[PDB]
RNA sequence: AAUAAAAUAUUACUUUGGAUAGUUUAGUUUCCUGGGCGAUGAAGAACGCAAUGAAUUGCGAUAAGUGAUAGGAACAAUAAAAUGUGAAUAUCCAAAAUUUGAAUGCUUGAAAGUAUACUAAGGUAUAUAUGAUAUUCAAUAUCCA
């Protein structure tokens, strides 16, 4: 056989078939535009940014 | 020999202190009933959410609260709004339930993270041991062609 080694052979590997959904949890996304941005910040040294360096 | 500043003595009032008296939404013991947790994720820890909160309380990205059922007019420190077309309040109920934690894909120091499969992001599954069934295999281990 040209080979001293003996491995553990190669056998069928099926895929998971679970037979009833494992969670309902409803697919919505909790972290949308709205969520991700909390309010802009209105401070005066955050103010001074947007008329030359164009930043919010 | 002499004065009463100091010193001493009693009473009244004031002061420092908090005993004494009155009081209790706190405890101690005994007895009665139960002794009802968790991979459908427990107990514990962390972080976060009130119009103005630091703690505490309640709660979990639906945040000092949502729906349903009872409940009937409030709350209050200050404004606002909503309100018998239903305010507070209550519940063995329903929806929701962040990071961890037996913690369980892999790693975890105070570590930021990260692989595959299924349904760019999001959400599930994948630890160890283990009972049953299906399935693919290994061993000339016993025969046998």
């Given at each position: 056989?040209?080979?001293?080694?003996?491995?553990?052979?190669?056998?069928?590997?099926?895929?998971?078939?679970?037979?009833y959904?494992?969670?309902?949890?409803?697919?919505?996304?909790?972290?949308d535009?709205?969520?991700?941005?909390?309010?802009?910040?209105?401070?005066?040294?955050?103010?001074?940014?947007?008329?030359?360096?164009?930043?919010?």
């Amino acid at each position: 056989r040209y080979t001293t080694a003996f491995h553990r052979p190669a056998t069928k590997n099926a895929a998971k078939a679970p037979k009833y959904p494992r969670s309902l949890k409803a697919n919505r996304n909790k972290m949308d535009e709205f969520s991700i941005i909390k309010f802009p910040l209105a401070t005066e040294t955050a103010l001074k940014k947007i008329e030359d360096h164009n930043t919010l």
